[PDB]
C-alpha cells in the first residue's frame, strides 16, 4: 500500500469502473465470444479494468506507476487494435481522458 496506489483505486478505478463506457473494459478480451480470432496475434499483453481491480485489490503492485502502466496498455492496446472508426475508440478516448484528468491531481510518494 502506498498514498498513490490508494489515491488509483480510490479516486481513478472508482470513478472508471462506473462510467458508462466501461462495460466493454471490465473484463479480459474475449476473442472467442467476439469473432475476433486475429486478437491476440496482434495484441500481445491483454489489459482490463477487472485484472487492474483485483491487482489494487490483492496488493499486486509495488508502485504507482506499474498500476498507471497497466491502465495505459487497456487503452493503447484498444487504438491499436480497432479500426479507427470505431466506436470503442471514442469510449476508449474518454475513459483515458479522466484517467489523465485524475492523474494530474495525485500524490507524489
Ligand atoms: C476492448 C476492445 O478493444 N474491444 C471489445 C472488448 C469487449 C467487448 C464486449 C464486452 C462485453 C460484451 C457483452 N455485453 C453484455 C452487456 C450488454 C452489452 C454486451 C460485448 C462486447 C467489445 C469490444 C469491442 N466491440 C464493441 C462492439 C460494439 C460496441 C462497443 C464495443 C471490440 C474490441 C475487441
Given at each position: 500500500?502506498?498514498?498513490?496506489?490508494?489515491?488509483?483505486?480510490?479516486?481513478?478505478?472508482?470513478?472508471?469502473?462506473?462510467?458508462?463506457?466501461?462495460?466493454?473494459?471490465?473484463?479480459?478480451?474475449?476473442?472467442?465470444?467476439?469473432?475476433?480470432?486475429?486478437?491476440?496475434?496482434?495484441?500481445?499483453?491483454?489489459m482490463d479494468m477487472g485484472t487492474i481491480k483485483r491487482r489494487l485489490?490483492?496488493?499486486?503492485?509495488?508502485?504507482?506507476?506499474?498500476?498507471?502502466?497497466?491502465?495505459?496498455?487497456?487503452?493503447?492496446?484498444?487504438?491499436?487494435?480497432?479500426?479507427?472508426?470505431?466506436?470503442?475508440?471514442?469510449?476508449?478516448?474518454?475513459?483515458?481522458?479522466?484517467?489523465?484528468?485524475?492523474?494530474?491531481?495525485?500524490?507524489?510518494?
Open positions: 500500500v502506498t498514498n498513490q496506489l490508494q489515491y488509483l483505486h480510490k479516486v481513478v478505478m472508482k470513478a472508471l469502473w462506473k462510467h458508462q463506457f466501461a462495460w466493454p473494459f471490465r473484463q479480459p478480451v474475449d476473442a472467442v465470444k467476439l469473432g475476433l480470432p486475429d486478437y491476440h496475434k496482434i495484441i500481445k499483453q491483454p485489490e490483492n496488493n499486486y503492485y509495488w508502485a504507482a506507476s506499474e498500476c498507471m502502466q497497466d491502465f495505459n496498455t487497456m487503452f493503447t492496446n484498444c487504438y491499436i487494435y480497432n479500426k479507427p472508426t470505431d466506436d470503442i475508440v471514442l469510449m476508449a478516448q474518454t475513459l483515458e481522458k479522466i484517467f489523465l484528468q485524475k492523474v494530474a491531481s495525485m500524490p507524489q510518494e
